[PDB]
Each structure stands twice: as structure tokens, then as C-alpha cells.
Amino acid sequence: WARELGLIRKPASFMTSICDERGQELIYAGMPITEVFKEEMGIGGVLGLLWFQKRLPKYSCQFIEMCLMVTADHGPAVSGAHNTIICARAGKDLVSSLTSGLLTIGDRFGGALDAAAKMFSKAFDSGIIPMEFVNKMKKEGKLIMGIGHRVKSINNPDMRVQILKDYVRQHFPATPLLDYALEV
Amino acid sequence: WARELGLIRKPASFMTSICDERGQELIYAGMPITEVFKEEMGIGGVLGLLWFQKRLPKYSCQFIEMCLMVTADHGPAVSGAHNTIICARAGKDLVSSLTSGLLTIGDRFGGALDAAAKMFSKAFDSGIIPMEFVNKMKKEGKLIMGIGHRVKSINNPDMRVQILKDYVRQHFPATPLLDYALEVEKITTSKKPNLILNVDGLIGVAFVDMLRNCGSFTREEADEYIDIGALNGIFVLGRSMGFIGHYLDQKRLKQGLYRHPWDDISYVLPEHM
Amino acid sequence: WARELGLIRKPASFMTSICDERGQELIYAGMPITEVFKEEMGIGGVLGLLWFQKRLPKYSCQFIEMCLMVTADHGPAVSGAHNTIICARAGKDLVSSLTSGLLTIGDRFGGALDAAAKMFSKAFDSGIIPMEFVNKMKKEGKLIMGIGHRVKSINNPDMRVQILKDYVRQHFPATPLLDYALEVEKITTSKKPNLILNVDGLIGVAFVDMLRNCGSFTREEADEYIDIGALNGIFVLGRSMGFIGHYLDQKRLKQGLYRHPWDDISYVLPEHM
Amino acid sequence: GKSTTLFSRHTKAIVWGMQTRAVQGMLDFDYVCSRDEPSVAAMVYPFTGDHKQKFYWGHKEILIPVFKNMADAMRKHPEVDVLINFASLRSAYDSTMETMNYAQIRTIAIIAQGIPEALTRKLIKKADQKGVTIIGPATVGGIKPGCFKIGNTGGML
Numbered sequence: 087w088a089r090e091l092g093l094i095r096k097p098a099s100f101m102t103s104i105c106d107e108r109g110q111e112l113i114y115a116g117m118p119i120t121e122v123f124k125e126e127m128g129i130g131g132v133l134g135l136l137w138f139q140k141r142l143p144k145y146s147c148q149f150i151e152m153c154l155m156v157t158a159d160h161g162p163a164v165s166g167a168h169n170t171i172i173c174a175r176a177g178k179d180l181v182s183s184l185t186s187g188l189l190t191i192g193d194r195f196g197g198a199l200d201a202a203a204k205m206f207s208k209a210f211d212s213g214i215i216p217m218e219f220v221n222k223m224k225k226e227g228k229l230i231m232g233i234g235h236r237v238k239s240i241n242n243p244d245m246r247v248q249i250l251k252d253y254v255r256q257h258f259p260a261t262p263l264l265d266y267a268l269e270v
Numbered sequence: 271w272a273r274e275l276g277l278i279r280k281p282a283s284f285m286t287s288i289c290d291e292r293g294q295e296l297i298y299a300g301m302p303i304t305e306v307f308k309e310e311m312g313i314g315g316v317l318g319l320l321w322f323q324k325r326l327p328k329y330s331c332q333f334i335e336m337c338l339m340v341t342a343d344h345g346p347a348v349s350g351a352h353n354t355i356i357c358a359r360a361g362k363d364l365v366s367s368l369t370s371g372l373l374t375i376g377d378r379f380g381g382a383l384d385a386a387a388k389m390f391s392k393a394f395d396s397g398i399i400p401m402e403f404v405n406k407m408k409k410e411g412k413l414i415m416g417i418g419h420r421v422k423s424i425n426n427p428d429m430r431v432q433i434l435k436d437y438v439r440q441h442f443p444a445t446p447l448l449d450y451a452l453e454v455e456k457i458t459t460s461k462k463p464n465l466i467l468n469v470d471g472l473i474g475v476a477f478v479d480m481l482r483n484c485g486s487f488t489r490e491e492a493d494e495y496i497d498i499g500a501l502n503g504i505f506v507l508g509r510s511m512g513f514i515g516h517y518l519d520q521k522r523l524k525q526g527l528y529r530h531p532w533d534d535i536s537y538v539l540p541e542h543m
Numbered sequence: 544w545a546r547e548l549g550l551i552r553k554p555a556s557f558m559t560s561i562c563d564e565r566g567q568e569l570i571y572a573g574m575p576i577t578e579v580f581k582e583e584m585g586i587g588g589v590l591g592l593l594w595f596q597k598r599l600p601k602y603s604c605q606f607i608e609m610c611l612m613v614t615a616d617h618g619p620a621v622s623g624a625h626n627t628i629i630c631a632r633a634g635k636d637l638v639s640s641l642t643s644g645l646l647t648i649g650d651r652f653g654g655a656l657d658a659a660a661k662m663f664s665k666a667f668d669s670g671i672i673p674m675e676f677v678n679k680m681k682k683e684g685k686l687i688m689g690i691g692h693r694v695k696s697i698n699n700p701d702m703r704v705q706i707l708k709d710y711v712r713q714h715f716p717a718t719p720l721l722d723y724a725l726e727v728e729k730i731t732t733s734k735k736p737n738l739i740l741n742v743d744g745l746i747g748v749a750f751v752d753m754l755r756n757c758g759s760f761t762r763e764e765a766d767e768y769i770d771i772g773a774l775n776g777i778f779v780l781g782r783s784m785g786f787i788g789h790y791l792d793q794k795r796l797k798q799g800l801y802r803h804p805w806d807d808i809s810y811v812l813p814e815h816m
Numbered sequence: 817g818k819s820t821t822l823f824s825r826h827t828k829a830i831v832w833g834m835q836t837r838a839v840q841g842m843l844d845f846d847y848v849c850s851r852d853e854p855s856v857a858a859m860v861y862p863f864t865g866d867h868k869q870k871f872y873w874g875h876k877e878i879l880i881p882v883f884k885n886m887a888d889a890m891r892k893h894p895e896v897d898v899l900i901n902f903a904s905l906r907s908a909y910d911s912t913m914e915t916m917n918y919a920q921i922r923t924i925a926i927i928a929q930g931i932p933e934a935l936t937r938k939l940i941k942k943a944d945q946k947g948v949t950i951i952g953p954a955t956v957g958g959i960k961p962g963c964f965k966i967g968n969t970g971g972m973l
């Protein structure tokens with residue numbers, strides 16, 4: 087009653103920018119939930135609103151959804167899916183079993199998306215040719231992240247790579263880091 | 271400035287009773303931290319202050335520490351220690367690797383301490399003889415929790431059970447639930463020699479015996495702590511020691527990332543559905 | 544049947560060194576569980592077996608238990624105890640509620656034990672005087688970890704620090720890193736009276752002093768355990784006691800589901816982006 | 817200054833690279849040849865940290881240390897006199913000239929095929945100066961039955 091009519095001030099200890107729910111409508115980064123569904127953005131559309139607070143173009147939204155389908159599962163033998171199955175077989179709930187395997191994600195399992203993005207952008211920003219980048223990383227005793235498959239090599243390509251690379255070439259306006267990584 | 275001189279009132283959204291730190295001294299349930307160390311209570315002494323807010327007697331405190339040493343680790347083959355080792359070998363930190371294995375603790379792994387304590391107390395409170403309790407649980411199609419070992423049967427007893435049972439008989443003033451569970455054990459060893467009180471079932475019936483027969487707790491208070499899961503916390507705090515030791519072991523051995531073999535997995539995927 | 548009589552060999556994908564359970568007795572790093580209880584080591588004794596695989600001396604074992612009692616809880620206002628109470632008030636189990644607050648432990652909450660141990664050992668190993676260490680860290684724009692209390696400054700000392708510092712001086716054979724950190728503390732109290740050794744920085748410099756000056760460890764072994772995070776596990780095992788006590792407190796008080804007030808949140812959402 | 821007896825039953829080798837099947841073929845050869853010790857004492861892989869790789873001494877599991885740097889392997893294993901260089905054609909020249917800076921190595925086995933002839937002559941010239949036998953390049957190595965075999969020579973068991 088004292089805060090409503092303005093005699094006291096109390097500092098807000100939290101700051102948020104992705105969602106406003108204290109209104110007539112749920113709002114995703116300045117956009118109401120009816121306009122979210124009216125303009126036909128999908129899960130990749132609301133991912134741009136919640137994670138970046140931006141109106142992304144329809145190819146950028148659809149590329150995000152395609153990234154979620156190719157990373158959706160890679161069998162039970164991986165380290166995170168192993169831990170989920172052990173926690174599921176121990177009679178735990180969905181939240182605990184997800185969590186026990188989701189916490190394996192980190193540097194050795196599931197970190198190669200973020201590691202390769204930092205690796206190739208650092209070489210491309212500090213502008214060196216792809217031949218010098220391969221020779222730079224060899225003398226530092228480090229393998230290039232995002233390079234190297236166990237079985238699918240060449241003339242037998244990875245099909246998840248070929249689906250996403252075909253989408254990026256057709257729809258993206260400019261791909262300088264992709265063209266750098268393809269020369270590497 | 272308005273709250274200090276009392277013009278406004280604002281409701282406190284949280285309530286705590288185990289620790290006061292906004293003073294000259296850290297306080298564990300009404301007891302200052304210097305008096306905690308002066309009166310020579312240990313880790314089991316401060317466990318009684320933090321979890322029950324009670325001055326427990328020195329045998330009750332020392333029994334709690336002995337429960338944490340016998341539940342400390344049981345090898346890497348158990349489900350929780352498996353998950354800690356996988357998360358440690360995946361290059362994760364101590365907190366994440368502990369957590370990934372600590373979250374396996376639940377009903378099938380590590381729940382037999384709390385399950386046997388609820389099982390034997392329900393039979394003892396709704397007073398039936400141990401012969402009727404064995405026959406009651408047989409016709410319901412349920413095995414008695416805390417009964418039955420894989421290898422150590424009789425004249426080859428479980429040594430963790432024999433350490434803790436010797437302590438409880440000498441030091442506790444009265445153990446009615448332990449004596450009930452030992453008569454249930456006498457009946458179940460007439461069926462198979464293996465069906466003895468586990469270390470899970472011994473801790474379960476003696477922790478209940480520690481609560482309602484030490485004088486610190488009333489009966490509705492001791493029944494509440496078993497109901498809200500104090501014996502879940504005894505296993506979890508004990509087994510967190512061995513899981514951290516399992517984490518620190520895999521960092522020293524420098525074990526690489528684990529992938530499960532494909533021949534140990536049976537793929538029974540549908541045809542095209 | 545083919546593995547038992549030796550026609551095939553299959554590589555073991557796991558390696559463990561802390562616990563053997565496939566025998567007549569449970570074994571904690573080469574020591575049977577009956578000899579663990581016969582020789583009267585406590586929780587700090589089995590912590591040395593599970594985490595370091597060593598027979599520690601009785602002062603080193605008792606110092607480990609004292610570190611777990613002073614890190615046991617520090618009220619509900621800290622970030623980890625906050626998250627445990629929210630998860631307890633949301634109707635979750637003991638394991639999930641512990642975990643939600645235990646995963647807050649990291650760099651800004653609960654990392655000052657491991658950070659100060661790495662900080663003071665690096666200065667002491669690369670031998671510089673404590674006056675040069677204070678001047679080195681000032682020009683790098685970094686505060687000394689394990690230095691500085693909010694309220695207890697000087698002639699009003701921290702009582703958790705005074706309990707543990709008195710134990711370390713009486714019982715440890717040699718404390719070179721503690722004496723280095725106390726001379727750093729003498730310099731920083733000439734700037735502000737508040738800049739004393741914390742309980743985070745005391746435990747950090749004395750756990751390192753316990754490792755390389757008890758005779759169980761070599762220098763590369765003691766430096767490895769600090770590097771892989773043994774002092775992260777000391778805070779986590781200690782603070783897991785108070786977090787379970789914070790869980791059991793909110794179940795007894797029967798606190799309902801928490802929603803944060805909207806007036807404590809500042810909504811700075813974009814206009815239409 | 818070349819020796820006559822290159823290999824014996826006490827011959828120790830350091831294998832340059834992750835060839836775990838090739839190294840296990842050597843330890844399968846040694847146990848069947850009734851050796852006291854395995855031929856491979858250490859492995860050198862520059863793209864990973866120092867650790868230990870699990871192998872077989874027959875039915876018994878042993879650990880062979882892996883080193884990031886060659887100098888750590890030569891210092892901790894002074895009894896090694898053979899290097900088996902499993903580096904590629906574009907990396908075998910720099911690995912072989914680096915291992916001639918250690919006087920303990922008397923025999924070098926170069927497995928890679930495709931090394932340029934100008935770079936191979938510099939390997940021959942410096943081995944002539946240091947008195948070091950080189951078996952290769954473009955070889956499987958060699959086998960001395962009862963004593964020692966080089967890498968993948970002779971196939972599986």
C-alpha cells in the first residue's frame with residue numbers, strides 16, 4: 087500500500103528482458119503471444135525472441151529448427167544418453183533422468199559446436215589463410231574442432247552435414263565463415 | 271530507512287530454523303559455533319543441530335557418523351557411482367559429476383534405508399507378531415525391504431551389519447524396532463540363509479530406534495522426520511563422499527571420454543514407424 | 544564361462560582405486576571396513592581413504608572433520624541455500640532439492656576455498672615476499688581471494704577462523720603456507736581492518752598445508768589434488784549437510800510454493816524486437 | 817659407426833603416434849616369444865596430454881605411458897634404443913630429425929610412404945653423422961623372431 091502510492095522506493099534485485107507475463111497477454115521480448123502465432127514463426131521463431139530478443143528472418147528461424155532436429159539424438163552409446171538410461175532404469179522421474187544425462191554435456195561431450203565456432207571465428211577474424219590456420223594448429227599440438235568423422239569420409243558424406251549445408255548455401259545471404267571452414 | 275524506524279511492514283516470504291548467520295557468531299539451531307566445538311560434538315553432532323535442531327546424546331551423534339562411514343561407498347558398479355564416473359570422464363567439474371550420480375539415488379538405488387524404516391515401523395506400530403508380518407507381506411506379493419544379501423548369508427555375516435549392530439546393542443538404551451527386525455530376520459533365515467538384515471535395513475530400523483528412544487524427540491516428531499526423508503539424507507550425505515572420491519579418482523587416472531559399446535546395446539527399433 | 548577359464552580376453556573399460564566391494568569385506572583403498580572402525584578413524588579418516596587413498600594422521604583426519612563443520616551451513620540467504628529452499632517449497636524430493644542448490648556451487652559461490660588455495664600457493668611456490676604479492680595483485684586489478692570479511696574486522700575476529708587457526712598451530716608439524724597467508728593478512732589489515740583471512744582462505748591455505756606437510760603426500764601428489772579440486776569437494780560435502788537441513792526444515796514448516804514478487808523484478812524488455 | 821645387433825630380447829622401443837593395434841601386436845609378439853618385458857616402453861603423441869594407455873601382457877592388463885613431448889619420453893625411459901616412427905609423410909621428417917638429437921636411439925623405423933627424396937637424403941645424411949640405422953622410409957619395418965618385431969610386421973598373431 088505504501089509502494090503503490092509512492093512514499094517508499096525499494097530496489098529491484100532482478101532484471102529480465104525475455105518475457106513479460108504481468109499483463110493481459112504473455113509477451114515474448116516485446117511481442118505478444120497472439121502476434122507470435124499470427125505471423126507463423128515456429129519454435130525457431132520463439133527461440134530468437136527468448137534467446138536473442140530479435141525478430142529473425144524466416145530462413146534464420148527455420149535454420150534453428152533444423153539444427154535442433156539433427157542434434158536431437160545420436161543413439162544411446164553417447165555419454166549423456168547413457169546417464170539418462172541409467173537414471174531411468176533406477177526408477178527416477180523424467181526430470182531427474184534428463185538432468186543426470188544433460189549434465190554430462192560440457193567440454194568432451196557436446197562441446198564441439200561451441201568449440202568449433204570459437205575456433206574458426208578466431209582464425210577468420212584475425213585474418214589468416216586456411217593453409218596457415220591448419221599449420222598454426224598443428225604446431226600448437228591441437229586438433230581442429232569440428233573436423234573429422236569416424237566412418238563417413240569423402241564420396242560417402244555425412245548426410246546431416248549435407249542436409250544443413252544445402253540449406254545454408256541456398257537461403258543465407260552471405261556465408262564467409264562457412265566458406266572459410268570449407269577451405270579448411 | 272523506512273523499515274528500520276518502523277513506518278512500513280513487509281511480510282517475510284521465507285522462514286528458517288537451522289542456522290543464524292546475521293550476528294557476531296554463526297549459530298547452529300540456537301547453539302553458537304564456539305560452543306559447538308567446545309563441547310566436542312562431531313559431524314554427527316552438527317547433523318543433529320542442522321537436521322533435527324536438537325542436542326543429541328553422544329552415542330546418538332557417534333551412531334550417525336558410523337552410518338555415514340558404512341554408506342560412504344560401495345564400489346563403482348552401483349548405478350550412482352557409474353553416473354559420476356561417466357560425467358567425470360566427460361571432462362565435467364566436481365559439482366556436475368557428483369550431481370549426475372547423486373540424482374540416481376531414489377527408489378531402486380539408495381532407497382532401501384528409507385523404505386525398510388517405513389516398512390518395519392508400520393508393522394511394529396500396527397502391532398503384529400513378526401511371523402504375521404512375514405506372512406502378510408508374502409500374500410501381498412512384496413519382498414521385505416532391508417532383508418536379503420547376495421553372498422553373505424549366515425555364519426558368514428555382513429561385517430558392516432555386525433559393526434553397527436554391536437554398537438546399537440551396547441550404547442542405545444532401548445531398541446524395540448531392532449529387536450522386532452531381528453525376529454523378522456530369524457524367520458526369513460529359516461527360508462533362505464541369505465535373507466538377513468542388510469546394512470540398508472539395519473540403518474533403517476536403528477535410525478528410527480535412535481529417534482524415538484533417545485529422549486530428544488517425541489513420537490509425532492520422530493515419525494515426521496522419517497516421513498519427510500531424514501534417512502534419504504543419511505544415504506545421500508554418506509554416498510556423496512564416495513562419489514567425490516570416485517570423481518577425484520578418474521581425474522587422477524586421466525580417463526578419457528566413455529562411449530558404451532554397441533554390442534552391449536540391443537537395438538529393437540521399429541521397421542518404419 | 545569362456546572368460547572364467549581364460550579363452551577370451553576383453554578390455555576393462557573402467558578403472559577404480561578407492562573401493563573394492565567384490566569380496567568378503569568392503570575395502571576402502573586397501574583397508575577393510577572392520578579395520579576402519581577398529582582403528583577409530585572417523586569421517587575424516589574415511590575421507591582420506593576415499594579421496595586420497597592414504598592413511599592420514601589423526602590430526603589430519605580431525606582437521607578434515609572440523610573443516611566440514613565450519614562449512615556446514617551459512618544461513619538461507621546464500622545462493623545455494625536459496626535454491627534448495629525454492630526446490631523444497633516446490634514439492635520436490637530431497638535429492639532434487641539438494642541438487643538444485645548444490646549446483647550453484649562453482650566460482651562465485653563456494654569457490655573461494657579452492658581459489659585462495661591456488662592463489663596463495665602460486666605466490667609461495669614462485670617465491671616472493673608477502674609485500675610483493677599484495678603489490679603484484681593490486682596492479683593486475685584483482686582482489687586477493689580469501690581476504691576480507693564484511694563485518695568482523697580486528698579485535699572482533701571471525702570465530703570460525705579462530706577455532707581452526709588454533710587447531711592448525713597446535714597440531715600441524717609445519718605450516719609454511721599459513722604463515723605466508725598470515726603475513727599477507729598483516730599487510731592487508733594495514734589498509735582496511737576488515738581485510739582478514741576468511742574461513743574460505745583459512746581452509747584453503749591450511750588444507751594445502753595439511754597435504755604437503757603431513758608426510759602422506761609428495762609435492763607433485765599434493766599439487767595434483769589441489770589442481771583436480773579436492774577443496775571444491777570439501778566445501779560441497781560440508782555444505783551438503785546444511786542444504787539437506789534446509790530441505791528438512793522447509794518440509795517441517797510446510798512452506799508452500801514460492802513465487803518471486805513482481806516489484807522485485809525490473810522488466811526491461813525491448814519495444815517490439 | 818653402425819652396429820651389428822640392432823635388436824635383442826632386451827630391446828625397448830618408443831612408438832611415435834596412436835597406433836594402439838600396432839603396439840598391441842608387438843606386445844602379443846613379445847609374450848609369445850617369452851620375453852621378460854614388452855618392446856614398447858612409451859608412446860609419443862603430440863596432440864594429447866601425458867597419460868597411460870591400457871594394453872595386454874598376454875591375459876594381464878598393463879599400462880604403457882603416453883607422452884606429449886619426445887623429450888619427456890626419452891628422459892623417463894633411458895633404456896629405449898629404437899624409435900618406430902608412425903608419423904605421416906608430411907610429418908615424418910620433422911619427427912626423425914628431432915629424435916636424432918637423443919643419443920640413446922640407435923635404430924629409427926619410418927613407416928610413411930610419400931616422403932620427398934630431398935628430405936629423405938637429409939635423413940640419410942644426419943643418420944650417417946650420428947651413426948643411426950634407419951629402416952625405411954616406406955617400410956613395415958622388420959622382424960627378429962624370438963627378440964623383437966617392428967610395428968605391424970608379420971601381421972596379426
Ligand SMILES: CC(C)(COP(=O)(O)OP(=O)(O)OC[C@H]1O[C@@H](n2cnc3c(N)ncnc32)[C@H](O)[C@@H]1OP(=O)(O)O)[C@@H](O)C(=O)NCCC(=O)NCCS
Nearest residue numbers: 404407408412413414415416417418419458460461462465
Ligand atoms: C525349489 C527351489 C528351486 C526354490 O526355492 P528357494 O530358492 O530356496 O527359495 P525361493 O527363491 O522360492 O524363496 C524362498 C523364500 O524366500 C522368500 N524371500 C526371498 N526374498 C525375500 C525378501 N527380500 N524378503 C522376504 N522374503 C524373501 C520368498 O518369498 C520365498 O518365500 P516362500 O518360500 O514362503 O514363498 C529350491 O527349493 C531348491 O533348490 N530346491 C531343491 C530342488 C530339489 O529338491 N530337487 C531334489 C531332486 S533333484
Ligand SMILES: CC(C)(COP(=O)(O)OP(=O)(O)OC[C@H]1O[C@@H](n2cnc3c(N)ncnc32)[C@H](O)[C@@H]1OP(=O)(O)O)[C@@H](O)C(=O)NCCC(=O)NCCS
Nearest residue numbers: 677680681685686687688689690691692731733734735738
Ligand atoms: C577514500 C576512502 C573513501 C576509500 O578508502 P577505503 O574504503 O579505506 O579503502 P578502499 O575501498 O579503496 O580499499 C582499501 C584498500 O584495500 C584493498 N582491498 C580491498 N579488498 C581487498 C581484498 N579482498 N584483497 C586485497 N586487497 C583489498 C583495496 O585494493 C585498497 O587498496 P589500495 O588502498 O592499495 O588501493 C576512505 O579512505 C575514506 O573514507 N577516507 C576518509 C575521507 C576523508 O579523509 N575525508 C576527510 C575530510 S571530511
Ligand SMILES: CC(C)(COP(=O)(O)OP(=O)(O)OC[C@H]1O[C@@H](n2cnc3c(N)ncnc32)[C@H](O)[C@@H]1OP(=O)(O)O)[C@@H](O)C(=O)NCCC(=O)NCCS
Nearest residue numbers: 229230233234902903904905906907927928929954955956
Ligand atoms: C604412417 C601412417 C600409419 C599414419 O598416417 P595417417 O593415419 O594417414 O595420418 P595421421 O593419423 O598421422 O594423421 C594425418 C594428419 O591428419 C591430421 N589430423 C588428424 N585429426 C585431425 C583433426 N581433427 N583436425 C585436423 N587435423 C587432423 C594429423 O595432425 C595429421 O597431420 P600431419 O600429417 O600434418 O601431421 C599412415 O600414413 C600409413 O598407413 N601409411 C602407410 C604405411 C606404409 O607406407 N607402408 C608401406 C610399406 S608396407
